[PDB]
Design an enzyme around this catalytic site. Structure first.
Site, PDB file in Angstrom:
ATOM      1  N   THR A   1      13.017   6.821 -13.528  1.00 31.49           N
ATOM      2  CA  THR A   1      12.276   7.748 -12.619  1.00 31.49           C
ATOM      3  C   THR A   1      11.319   7.013 -11.847  1.00 31.49           C
ATOM      4  O   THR A   1       9.947   7.157 -11.874  1.00 31.49           O
ATOM      5  CB  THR A   1      11.476   8.628 -13.913  1.00 31.49           C
ATOM      6  OG1 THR A   1      10.647   7.617 -14.655  1.00 31.49           O
ATOM      7  CG2 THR A   1      12.386   9.540 -14.906  1.00 31.49           C
TER       8      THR A   1
ATOM      9  N   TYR B   1       7.696   8.722 -10.351  1.00 28.62           N
ATOM     10  CA  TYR B   1       7.239  10.000 -10.805  1.00 28.62           C
ATOM     11  C   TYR B   1       7.355  10.057 -12.605  1.00 28.62           C
ATOM     12  O   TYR B   1       8.015   9.192 -13.041  1.00 28.62           O
ATOM     13  CB  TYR B   1       8.458  11.130 -10.612  1.00 28.62           C
ATOM     14  CG  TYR B   1       8.456  11.305  -8.875  1.00 28.62           C
ATOM     15  CD1 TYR B   1       7.296  12.108  -8.262  1.00 28.62           C
ATOM     16  CD2 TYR B   1       9.432  10.435  -8.353  1.00 28.62           C
ATOM     17  CE1 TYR B   1       7.402  11.805  -6.915  1.00 28.62           C
ATOM     18  CE2 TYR B   1       9.515  10.659  -7.104  1.00 28.62           C
ATOM     19  CZ  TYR B   1       8.564  11.369  -6.202  1.00 28.62           C
ATOM     20  OH  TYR B   1       8.752  11.278  -4.831  1.00 28.62           O
TER      21      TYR B   1
ATOM     22  N   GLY C   1       3.131  -8.821 -14.934  1.00 27.37           N
ATOM     23  CA  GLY C   1       3.811  -8.867 -16.126  1.00 27.37           C
ATOM     24  C   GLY C   1       2.942  -8.335 -17.242  1.00 27.37           C
ATOM     25  O   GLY C   1       3.020  -8.545 -18.341  1.00 27.37           O
ATOM     26  N   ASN C   2       1.726  -7.622 -16.984  1.00 25.64           N
ATOM     27  CA  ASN C   2       1.213  -6.791 -17.968  1.00 25.64           C
ATOM     28  C   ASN C   2       0.538  -5.494 -17.451  1.00 25.64           C
ATOM     29  O   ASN C   2       0.955  -5.187 -16.155  1.00 25.64           O
ATOM     30  CB  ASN C   2      -0.084  -7.791 -18.484  1.00 25.64           C
ATOM     31  CG  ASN C   2      -0.214  -7.499 -20.260  1.00 25.64           C
ATOM     32  OD1 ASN C   2      -0.627  -6.531 -20.328  1.00 25.64           O
ATOM     33  ND2 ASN C   2       0.251  -8.551 -20.826  1.00 25.64           N
TER      34      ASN C   2
ATOM     35  N   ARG D   1      -9.259 -13.757 -21.967  1.00 25.06           N
ATOM     36  CA  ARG D   1      -8.601 -14.037 -23.288  1.00 25.06           C
ATOM     37  C   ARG D   1      -8.939 -15.529 -23.523  1.00 25.06           C
ATOM     38  O   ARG D   1      -9.209 -16.540 -22.555  1.00 25.06           O
ATOM     39  CB  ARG D   1      -7.087 -13.721 -23.375  1.00 25.06           C
ATOM     40  CG  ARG D   1      -6.098 -14.413 -22.606  1.00 25.06           C
ATOM     41  CD  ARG D   1      -6.243 -13.952 -21.204  1.00 25.06           C
ATOM     42  NE  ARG D   1      -5.109 -14.351 -20.129  1.00 25.06           N
ATOM     43  CZ  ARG D   1      -5.038 -14.650 -19.124  1.00 25.06           C
ATOM     44  NH1 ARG D   1      -6.297 -14.431 -18.331  1.00 25.06           N
ATOM     45  NH2 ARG D   1      -4.124 -14.974 -18.318  1.00 25.06           N
TER      46      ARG D   1
ATOM     47  N   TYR E   1       5.444 -17.160 -29.612  1.00 23.43           N
ATOM     48  CA  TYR E   1       5.519 -15.944 -28.645  1.00 23.43           C
ATOM     49  C   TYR E   1       6.580 -15.289 -28.639  1.00 23.43           C
ATOM     50  O   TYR E   1       7.658 -15.868 -28.594  1.00 23.43           O
ATOM     51  CB  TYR E   1       5.420 -16.745 -27.150  1.00 23.43           C
ATOM     52  CG  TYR E   1       5.353 -15.407 -26.123  1.00 23.43           C
ATOM     53  CD1 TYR E   1       4.662 -14.577 -25.838  1.00 23.43           C
ATOM     54  CD2 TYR E   1       6.512 -15.904 -25.367  1.00 23.43           C
ATOM     55  CE1 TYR E   1       4.880 -13.612 -24.887  1.00 23.43           C
ATOM     56  CE2 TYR E   1       6.803 -15.063 -23.987  1.00 23.43           C
ATOM     57  CZ  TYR E   1       5.981 -13.794 -23.874  1.00 23.43           C
ATOM     58  OH  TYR E   1       6.251 -12.798 -23.009  1.00 23.43           O
TER      59      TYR E   1
ATOM     60  N   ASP F   1     -19.120   4.228  -3.602  1.00 22.14           N
ATOM     61  CA  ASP F   1     -17.574   4.552  -3.167  1.00 22.14           C
ATOM     62  C   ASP F   1     -17.245   3.567  -2.138  1.00 22.14           C
ATOM     63  O   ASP F   1     -16.093   3.182  -2.342  1.00 22.14           O
ATOM     64  CB  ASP F   1     -17.854   6.142  -2.446  1.00 22.14           C
ATOM     65  CG  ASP F   1     -17.816   7.092  -3.096  1.00 22.14           C
ATOM     66  OD1 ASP F   1     -17.714   7.040  -4.579  1.00 22.14           O
ATOM     67  OD2 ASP F   1     -17.879   8.410  -2.843  1.00 22.14           O
TER      68      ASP F   1
ATOM     69  N   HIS G   1      -0.389  -4.061  -2.797  1.00 14.06           N
ATOM     70  CA  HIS G   1      -1.479  -4.794  -2.457  1.00 14.06           C
ATOM     71  C   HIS G   1      -1.123  -5.727  -1.267  1.00 14.06           C
ATOM     72  O   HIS G   1      -0.338  -6.738  -1.754  1.00 14.06           O
ATOM     73  CB  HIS G   1      -2.070  -5.252  -3.855  1.00 14.06           C
ATOM     74  CG  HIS G   1      -3.396  -5.760  -3.668  1.00 14.06           C
ATOM     75  ND1 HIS G   1      -4.146  -6.853  -2.703  1.00 14.06           N
ATOM     76  CD2 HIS G   1      -4.597  -5.219  -4.285  1.00 14.06           C
ATOM     77  CE1 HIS G   1      -5.284  -6.865  -3.088  1.00 14.06           C
ATOM     78  NE2 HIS G   1      -5.612  -5.806  -3.814  1.00 14.06           N
TER      79      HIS G   1
ATOM     80  N   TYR H   1       4.739 -13.636 -13.562  1.00 16.86           N
ATOM     81  CA  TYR H   1       3.800 -13.783 -13.932  1.00 16.86           C
ATOM     82  C   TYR H   1       2.720 -14.312 -13.178  1.00 16.86           C
ATOM     83  O   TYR H   1       1.367 -14.130 -13.377  1.00 16.86           O
ATOM     84  CB  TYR H   1       4.125 -14.757 -15.201  1.00 16.86           C
ATOM     85  CG  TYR H   1       4.745 -14.177 -16.640  1.00 16.86           C
ATOM     86  CD1 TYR H   1       4.878 -12.809 -16.703  1.00 16.86           C
ATOM     87  CD2 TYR H   1       5.471 -14.868 -17.102  1.00 16.86           C
ATOM     88  CE1 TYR H   1       5.630 -12.253 -17.962  1.00 16.86           C
ATOM     89  CE2 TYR H   1       6.195 -14.451 -18.334  1.00 16.86           C
ATOM     90  CZ  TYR H   1       6.410 -13.227 -18.588  1.00 16.86           C
ATOM     91  OH  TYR H   1       6.927 -12.770 -19.704  1.00 16.86           O
TER      92      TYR H   1
HETATM   93  O1  LIG Z   1       4.471 -10.764 -23.376  1.00 19.13           O
HETATM   94  C1  LIG Z   1       3.761 -10.290 -22.716  1.00 19.13           C
HETATM   95  C2  LIG Z   1       3.574 -10.613 -21.126  1.00 19.13           C
HETATM   96  C3  LIG Z   1       3.160 -12.020 -20.722  1.00 19.13           C
HETATM   97  C4  LIG Z   1       1.945 -12.596 -21.598  1.00 19.13           C
HETATM   98  C5  LIG Z   1       1.819 -13.960 -21.153  1.00 19.13           C
HETATM   99  C6  LIG Z   1       2.738 -14.843 -21.572  1.00 19.13           C
HETATM  100  C7  LIG Z   1       3.731 -15.293 -20.858  1.00 19.13           C
HETATM  101  C8  LIG Z   1       4.582 -16.374 -21.230  1.00 19.13           C
HETATM  102  C9  LIG Z   1       4.454 -17.001 -22.458  1.00 19.13           C
HETATM  103  C10 LIG Z   1       5.504 -18.090 -22.913  1.00 19.13           C
HETATM  104  O2  LIG Z   1       6.597 -18.274 -22.313  1.00 19.13           O
HETATM  105  O3  LIG Z   1       5.172 -18.449 -24.052  1.00 19.13           O
HETATM  106  C11 LIG Z   1       3.591 -16.494 -23.300  1.00 19.13           C
HETATM  107  C12 LIG Z   1       2.569 -15.554 -22.878  1.00 19.13           C
HETATM  108  C13 LIG Z   1       0.672 -11.710 -21.319  1.00 19.13           C
HETATM  109  O4  LIG Z   1       0.595 -11.382 -19.998  1.00 19.13           O
HETATM  110  O5  LIG Z   1       0.017 -11.294 -22.184  1.00 19.13           O
HETATM  111  N1  LIG Z   1       3.199  -9.116 -22.697  1.00 19.13           N
HETATM  112  O6  LIG Z   1       3.083  -8.455 -24.164  1.00 19.13           O
HETATM  113 CA   LIG Z   2       8.349   6.990 -13.845  1.00 19.44          CA
HETATM  114 CL   LIG Z   3      -5.122  -9.442 -21.106  1.00 18.55          CL
HETATM  115 ZN   LIG Z   4       1.527  -8.328 -24.972  1.00 20.29          ZN
HETATM  116 ZN   LIG Z   5       4.850  -9.500 -25.250  1.00 18.82          ZN
END
Ligand SMILES: O=C(CC[C@@H](Cc1ccc(C(=O)O)cc1)C(=O)O)NO
Ligand SMILES: [Ca+2]
Ligand SMILES: [Cl-]
Ligand SMILES: [Zn+2]
Ligand SMILES: [Zn+2]
Ligand SMILES: *[C@@H]1O[C@H](CO)[C@@H](O[C@@H]2O[C@H](CO)[C@@H](O[C@@H]3O[C@H](CO)[C@@H](O)[C@H](O[C@@H]4O[C@H](CO)[C@@H](O)[C@H](O)[C@@H]4O)[C@@H]3O)[C@H](O)[C@H]2NC(C)=O)[C@H](O)[C@H]1NC(C)=O
Ligand SMILES: *[C@@H]1O[C@H](CO)[C@@H](O[C@@H]2O[C@H](CO)[C@@H](O[C@@H]3O[C@H](CO)[C@@H](O)[C@H](O[C@@H]4O[C@H](CO)[C@@H](O)[C@H](O)[C@@H]4O)[C@@H]3O)[C@H](O)[C@H]2NC(C)=O)[C@H](O)[C@H]1NC(C)=O
Ligand SMILES: *[C@@H]1O[C@H](CO)[C@@H](O[C@@H]2O[C@H](CO)[C@@H](O)[C@H](O)[C@H]2NC(C)=O)[C@H](O)[C@H]1NC(C)=O
Ligand SMILES: *[C@@H]1O[C@H](CO)[C@@H](O[C@@H]2O[C@H](CO)[C@@H](O)[C@H](O)[C@H]2NC(C)=O)[C@H](O)[C@H]1NC(C)=O
Ligand SMILES: *[C@@H]1O[C@H](CO)[C@@H](O[C@@H]2O[C@H](CO)[C@@H](O)[C@H](O)[C@H]2NC(C)=O)[C@H](O)[C@H]1NC(C)=O
Ligand SMILES: *[C@@H]1O[C@H](CO)[C@@H](O[C@@H]2O[C@H](CO)[C@@H](O)[C@H](O)[C@H]2NC(C)=O)[C@H](O)[C@H]1NC(C)=O
Ligand SMILES: O=C(CC[C@@H](Cc1ccc(C(=O)O)cc1)C(=O)O)NO
Ligand SMILES: *[C@@H]1O[C@H](CO)[C@@H](O)[C@H](O)[C@H]1NC(C)=O
Ligand SMILES: *[C@@H]1O[C@H](CO)[C@@H](O)[C@H](O)[C@H]1NC(C)=O
Ligand SMILES: *[C@@H]1O[C@H](CO)[C@@H](O)[C@H](O)[C@H]1NC(C)=O
Ligand SMILES: *[C@@H]1O[C@H](CO)[C@@H](O)[C@H](O)[C@H]1NC(C)=O
Ligand SMILES: *[C@@H]1O[C@H](CO)[C@@H](O)[C@H](O)[C@H]1NC(C)=O
Ligand SMILES: *[C@@H]1O[C@H](CO)[C@@H](O)[C@H](O)[C@H]1NC(C)=O
Ligand SMILES: *[C@@H]1O[C@H](CO)[C@@H](O)[C@H](O)[C@H]1NC(C)=O
Ligand SMILES: *[C@@H]1O[C@H](CO)[C@@H](O)[C@H](O)[C@H]1NC(C)=O
Ligand SMILES: [Ca+2]
Ligand SMILES: [Cl-]
Ligand SMILES: [Zn+2]
Ligand SMILES: [Zn+2]
Lengths: 686, 686
Positions: B214, B217, B463-464, B481, B491, B602, B625, B636
């Site tokens: 989707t 939307y 990627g987050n 963090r 991980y 604003d 962006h 990433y």
């Molecule tokens: O797993 C993720 C996306 C990537 C992670 C970062 C991350 C990306 C890669 C690794 C690895 O190769 O060990 C470890 C952590 C984040 O952005 O918190 N989100 O839950």
């Molecule tokens: Ca959607």
């Molecule tokens: Cl974070």
């Molecule tokens: Zn995560």
């Molecule tokens: Zn993860």
């Protein structure tokens, strides 16, 4: 210092003076004369009292005939001789035969070419006309020159329709049946089109893109331009317009099939045979076009005047109309621009006495509207972020009169209440309604098709300078002008002069003055009312109307809606929700502190904005308003729920019905989602 | 009631309690267990004192192994016998061997298949790795199974790279060289990856679209879904991950070319031959994958908590992080979610005493982040109009620790000052820095590469869950963090447990507490500071840095820049203008009345918004962006001026240089225009 003061300062005599001043020489976009008028307007708006007045210029694609190699059409015999030639200019009007630089009639953006072929008569060249030719009459336009009469739809849609049908050329003409009012004399003795009169006009299909070479981005000094081959919206076959003397010469020898019915016959003494080709005697003669116009990147200039707001300077109410004209622009646009000039003068008089509007007012004199809305669209592309976060409303201001019968308003439902309330406070200029309100005369002359005791207000379409603000950016927009009893004969001809207006349309300038009070009074309220003068409940009413209508179009195919499970329930649910939430919102608005006020006004300002889908409509990325878009068959007409409407259009002809009906369902989901999303912008914010 | 009060209410012991509570059973997206945790969180946030707490659910595409038909890889002999098989599960951690429903290792969204072929070793499967294989080593991946080690780039980019190279399958593995820290023991005796440990993870290439079915939307009840064949971002070849015991078995027989250099060799006792295929003895054996996972539309649930603002309830500061985990989520994400839970608890304690923030704070527990950021993206698609007109800032809150060395912040330059100021007021938790500020310890441990006495702050990548807010909608965003001394070994493995964190990462929970103070203190300032705590001058600094960098990449091709007249002058002019205008804006901000304030705020809120191009980046409409996008080689990593960067990438290989260099110029114009347009949002408004 109130609205009455603003309105009383406007003078008919001043409008007349400015109109005369604006219409003595041609102001074609991209010319010296139009730059000079822009400079004059900037100077005067400063003198009138605006805080700042700037020129905003862009370098855009324009199109002009070749001065030393004129455009014309011939009937050629088999020997190769040009036995009849169309006229190279309109006879100039009395007293103007020495004016230099009158551009001869041409279709702007036509490519060059000298195609030869058999004529086919395609009526108005509407989608339904081509369906009738091809599907019912079995007449094949491929490789033929089509001749079409102007009217009913935007000329660009005509050319697109001809192209898609395989035509190698288009000849456009004005039929007396559409452009000669019975019982009225031709210019200069009346307001009718003479047989040598010709309607100019662009034939682009830009779908809101603006300058063909820079879609998305302003045509500023460092712009990177597409090549002509990738330019947006340019026609691929030669096109030229003619008057009805010349048209008669081309139509009289027509053979082949008879016209399919009387709706296909104009007023010339000609059979209106559809062709292809001529009758027996002349079946060996052909039509040859000679088109040598060139597209040229050319500088254009907008005048942008600012009257800073006292309280919310970061909220913009815009009054904009174009300045460029085909020749003298006596109606189009100077009857509108003279009104804007007097509006600026009046606001500046209040300013000089110490008044300021609550919100900022921006005044615009747009260039190159006649070549595809280029000046307004480039400026809006340049300023899109300011406009979308700050733009309260846009009021257009092209021709103030196209008739002298009654008012014509086309606007967002958000301004219906504003327009009713304002016109009840204005005096009618009409004979027989002295002492009565404009509201009373307008509703009497142009009643609502739905509600007794209310006037007709139409949807906005496109093909004018509000298009980028409303259809692309989602800023609430409106327009108002005096009209006829239901275009006008001398539209885009050399005969649109100051004398046409002063002798035949509005000799007292009372209709101009009334239009100035309407446009000016709307801008005054929008810029000064504490709560923005938008009623969201009006939108809820029309959304139901449009949902009923689109469902009724789909229900022409009941078996397919059962088979493919095509349901409108989501759209109806969204509209019901919008109705309920709007109702609550209206209660809170009357029942509440400047942050609450400003938080509230922002909900009203961003409500039109919520109907924008950032993904655009299919293959039309610059038309983003999900409720309203220009009709795909007629840029001038508005369509509602256009995504669903176009999915359903001619659907019984689609080869894969599963896929076609899938796309109808996709559009219903997009519309339902957008209606609900807009409704939720009116919910309590947290 | 001030920031100190908020910060003092946060307790390490509470974070520890919540982490333990959140990590005893798996919470995989789309499962019963994760719905139950969502219900618990909603109940507790209400009890903590939020004004309202709702579940927002969507039906999205997810992917799971087949319970009765497990995924595995074989070496098959020529006879057809499977002579070696990879492991069907990770040995579960001590005390968890009876937990039900641990999902075995798999690559989410892999298609089904049983391809057989010769192995090619592709190092990290980065763009440069494939260039080296194909262009330098002349090794052809078409029809071969590639084996790649995890690390350096997002695994999805690995699979996309393999696909484009013609591979018929991908096997991903964790090499000890990348996931085994020297001198530390394997779980459960230390924090290192055991040889049976396997990194799960999705391999989509969604480019910000969210649910594959989707795009654009929300996946609500009436959504019309694409068919699987038109779904966005799904891989077209089978993929499966393994640990290094299994990897060794597959890599040890490898023949063909030697590794091109030592950067291609991991730590296994194996030659790291690139292939194709095995050595002499076994040149007739092959690798066979068996993948039977299925994609399934499945309901997911976000928890959305609201703390209404006292003064600007229509301005949103959002603290959001995901709740779904691959198995127990001991670090990813519950170390972040436990921090969010304690932040909500603290804010609610102040609320119960009569305090409210100036602006509205929204708290989010996102679902299905591990399957492509689906929960945050669907909610943002649903609420896009509210978010773009009201969204002040987004602070992410995934894993609070990935190490115990020092702080790591990645954010918009708009929050650099905020982050410096906040960390100077926070106590460092680090050994050797007792009594000293977090600012002092962080700058000492992670100095800026450019300025002495300041810490490193990085660009946001993707990627987050901040991706839709920042890259699509243009809402200022940040994340913070604790990290290691420069991912982490366990991980996405079953060994990421409460015990891993409590024994080896943060036994006092002091790093969790410090991260809670940073994320919480940022949200407090953003939601309560009278003037938004954004410094536009910081953006002007980085824009110059990025313009210098992109110009320096282009200047590797001086002859082509002369030939095609490739100029960066417009971009530099825009950046200079942004610098000057930002400087004036900052003077006015310190030198001024709630409308002026609200008009001003604003301007600060819409400044990130001004970097959004509604037309998106080429073929990536949801990355809008213009300054920042995820790298096309590594989701990433952040890239700056990505439109220009991608136009210049590998340009010397393009067949039509005129066209390639034209598109570089087009991107320079788009970037220059967008920088100037953003600058003009900071100009005086009228
Ligand atoms: O797993 C993720 C996306 C990537 C992670 C970062 C991350 C990306 C890669 C690794 C690895 O190769 O060990 C470890 C952590 C984040 O952005 O918190 N989100 O839950
Ligand atoms: Ca959607
Ligand atoms: Cl974070
Ligand atoms: Zn995560
Ligand atoms: Zn993860
Ligand atoms: C107009 O405004 C209404 C708000 O008053 C809003 O109503 C929502 O409607 C949706 C349906 O589109 C409801 O969705 C259900 O939510 C409950 C949980 O709250 C779910 O249990 C439920 O589960 C499903 O049942 C389905 C339908 O039979 C089934 O197909 C599924 O597989 C699943 O079992 C639904 O998802 C939501 O609760 C409503 N809020 C209410 C009633 O207050 C309208 O949607 C809105 N119109 C539009 C166009 O948005
Ligand atoms: C950074 O901020 C600057 C504002 O201080 C702004 O400067 C503007 O720059 C443009 C050039 O891109 C100027 O454009 C000229 O405008 C004048 C009229 O004001 C024109 O006469 C002039 O005509 C042309 O001359 C050209 C160049 O030699 C030639 O190629 C043309 O054919 C034509 O003859 C230019 O169009 C504008 O005036 C400037 N405002 C100033 C100086 O105050 C920068 O553009 C801005 N940077 C960016 C990226 O926006
Ligand atoms: C339209 O009106 C304007 C404004 O009065 C006239 O422009 C002025 O012309 C006078 C006399 O030549 C000059 O002294 C002024 O400098 C002009 N003012 C401007 C440009 O602001 C203009 O000539 C009139 N045009 C016509 C056709 O009557
Ligand atoms: C148009 O005029 C009507 C009648 O004056 C306005 O409606 C009234 O608005 C006031 C102010 O909130 C209310 O207290 C009355 O109850 C309303 N009367 C009604 C609904 O009959 C209406 O607001 C005006 N429209 C605008 C300003 O857009
Ligand atoms: C995590 O903590 C919650 C909150 O205390 C526990 O949920 C409660 O469980 C008790 C005892 O069964 C019930 O009486 C309550 O109804 C629950 N409260 C909720 C759901 O809000 C939950 O069981 C804990 N989980 C673990 C694994 O310890
Ligand atoms: C970070 O802290 C610095 C130092 O306190 C702040 O900069 C000061 O802000 C005040 C209030 O406007 C000014 O009067 C001082 O001149 C500033 N000092 C400087 C620039 O050295 C800065 O505003 C804070 N950053 C935020 C709140 O984002
Ligand atoms: O000429 C135009 C666009 C169309 C006009 C409306 C119009 C459209 C068509 C006719 C006609 O066929 O005579 C006449 C007028 C407007 O929107 O003001 N703008 O300058
Ligand atoms: C106009 O006339 C002829 C056409 O060939 C030529 O001399 C001249 O180049 C043309 N002008 C243009 C194309 O602007
Ligand atoms: C039409 O014009 C052409 C070119 O100027 C000329 O050769 C021919 O004589 C003309 N035909 C008529 C009927 O005037
Ligand atoms: C119609 O036009 C031409 C006639 O010359 C023919 O070549 C073409 O293929 C025809 N096509 C259709 C669809 O009738
Ligand atoms: C002006 O109004 C009169 C009065 O009805 C009408 O007869 C005439 O046609 C009008 N003129 C124009 C141009 O409409
Ligand atoms: C899982 O196992 C087999 C594979 O063919 C089959 O019985 C069952 O349909 C599969 N489950 C799915 C596809 O969800
Ligand atoms: C691999 O598994 C298959 C299928 O279960 C089996 O036939 C084969 O014996 C196995 N090979 C080994 C070495 O265990
Ligand atoms: C490489 O792969 C296969 C080898 O079987 C071959 O068919 C293909 O055409 C080759 N292509 C290139 C570009 O080397
Ligand atoms: C915790 O910090 C100590 C102290 O330097 C370090 O040696 C150890 O490796 C750290 N633990 C983790 C998981 O990083
Ligand atoms: Ca443009
Ligand atoms: Cl108008
Ligand atoms: Zn006009
Ligand atoms: Zn016109």
């Amino acid at each position: 210092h109130n609205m009455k003061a603003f309105l009383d300062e406007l003078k008919a005599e001043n409008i007349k003076k400015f109109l005369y001043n604006f219409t003595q020489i041609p102001h074609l976009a991209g010319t010296e004369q139009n730059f000079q008028l822009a400079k004059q307007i900037q100077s005067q708006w400063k003198e009138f009292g605006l805080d700042s007045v700037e020129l905003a210029h862009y370098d855009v694609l324009l199109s002009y005939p070749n001065k030393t190699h004129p455009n014309y059409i011939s009937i050629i015999n088999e020997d190769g001789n040009e036995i009849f030639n169309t006229s190279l200019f309109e006879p100039p009007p009395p007293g103007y035969e020495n004016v230099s630089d009158i551009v001869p009639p041409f279709s702007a953006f036509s490519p060059q070419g000298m195609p030869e072929g058999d004529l086919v008569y395609v009526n108005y060249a509407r989608t339904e006309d081509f369906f009738k030719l091809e599907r019912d009459m079995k007449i094949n336009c491929s490789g033929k020159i089509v001749i079409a009469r102007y009217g009913k739809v935007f000329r660009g849609n005509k050319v697109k329709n001809a192209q898609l049908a395989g035509a190698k050329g288009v000849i456009l003409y004005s039929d007396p049946a559409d452009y000669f009012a019975p019982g009225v004399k031709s210019y200069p003795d009346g307001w009718n089109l003479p047989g040598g009169g010709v309607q100019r006009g662009n034939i682009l299909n830009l779908n809101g893109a603006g300058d063909p070479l820079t879609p998305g981005y302003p045509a500023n000094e460092y712009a990177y331009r597409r090549g002509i081959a990738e330019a947006v919206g340019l026609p691929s076959i030669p096109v030229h317009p003619i008057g009805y003397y010349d048209a008669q010469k081309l139509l009289e020898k027509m053979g082949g099939s008879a016209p399919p019915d009387s709706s296909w016959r104009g007023s010339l003494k000609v059979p209106y045979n559809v062709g292809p080709g001529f009758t027996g005697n002349f079946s060996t003669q052909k039509v040859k076009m000679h088109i040598h116009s060139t597209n040229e990147v050319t500088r254009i200039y907008n005048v942008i005047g600012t009257l800073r707001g006292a309280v919310e300077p970061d909220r913009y109410v815009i009054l904009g109309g174009h300045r460029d004209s085909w020749v003298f622009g006596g109606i189009d646009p100077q009857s509108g621009a003279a009104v804007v000039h007097e509006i600026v003068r009046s606001f500046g008089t209040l300013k000089k006495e110490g008044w300021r509007p609550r919100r900022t007012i921006l005044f615009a004199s747009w260039d190159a509207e006649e070549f595809g809305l280029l000046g307004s669209t480039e400026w809006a592309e340049e300023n899109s972020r300011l406009l979308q976060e700050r733009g309260v409303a846009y009021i257009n201001a092209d021709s103030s009169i196209e008739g002298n019968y009654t008012l014509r308003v086309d606007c967002t439902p958000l301004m219906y209440s504003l327009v009713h309330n304002l016109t009840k406070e204005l005096k009618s200029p009409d004979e027989g309604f002295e002492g009565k309100s404009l509201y009373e005369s307008w509703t009497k002359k142009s009643p609502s098709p739905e509600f007794s005791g209310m006037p007709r207000i139409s949807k906005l379409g496109s093909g004018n300078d509000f298009e980028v603000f409303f259809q692309r950016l989602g800023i609430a927009s409106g327009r108002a002008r005096y009209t006829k009893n239901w275009g006008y004969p001398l539209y885009h001809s050399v005969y649109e002069t100051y004398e046409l207006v002063e002798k035949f349309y509005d000799p007292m300038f009372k209709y101009h003055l009334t239009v100035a009070q309407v446009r000016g009074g709307m801008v005054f309220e929008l810029a000064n009312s504490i709560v923005l003068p938008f009623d969201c409940r009006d939108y809820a009413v029309v959304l139901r109307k449009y949902a009923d209508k689109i469902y009724s179009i789909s229900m022409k195919h009941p078996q397919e809606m059962k088979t493919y499970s095509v349901s409108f329930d989501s759209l109806f649910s969204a509209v019901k929700n919008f109705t309920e939430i709007a109702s609550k919102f209206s209660e809170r608005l009357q029942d509440f502190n400047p942050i609450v006020l400003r938080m509230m006004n922002d909900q009203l300002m961003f409500l039109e904005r919520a109907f924008i889908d950032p993904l655009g409509l299919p293959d039309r990325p610059f038309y983003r308003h999900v409720i309203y878009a220009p009709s795909s068959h007629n840029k001038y007409a508005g369509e509602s729920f256009p995504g669903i409407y176009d999915a359903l259009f001619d659907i019984e002809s689609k080869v894969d019905p599963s896929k076609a009906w899938g796309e109808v369902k996709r559009q219903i989901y997009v519309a339902a989602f957008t209606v609900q999303a807009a409704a939720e912008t009116l919910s309590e914010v947290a």
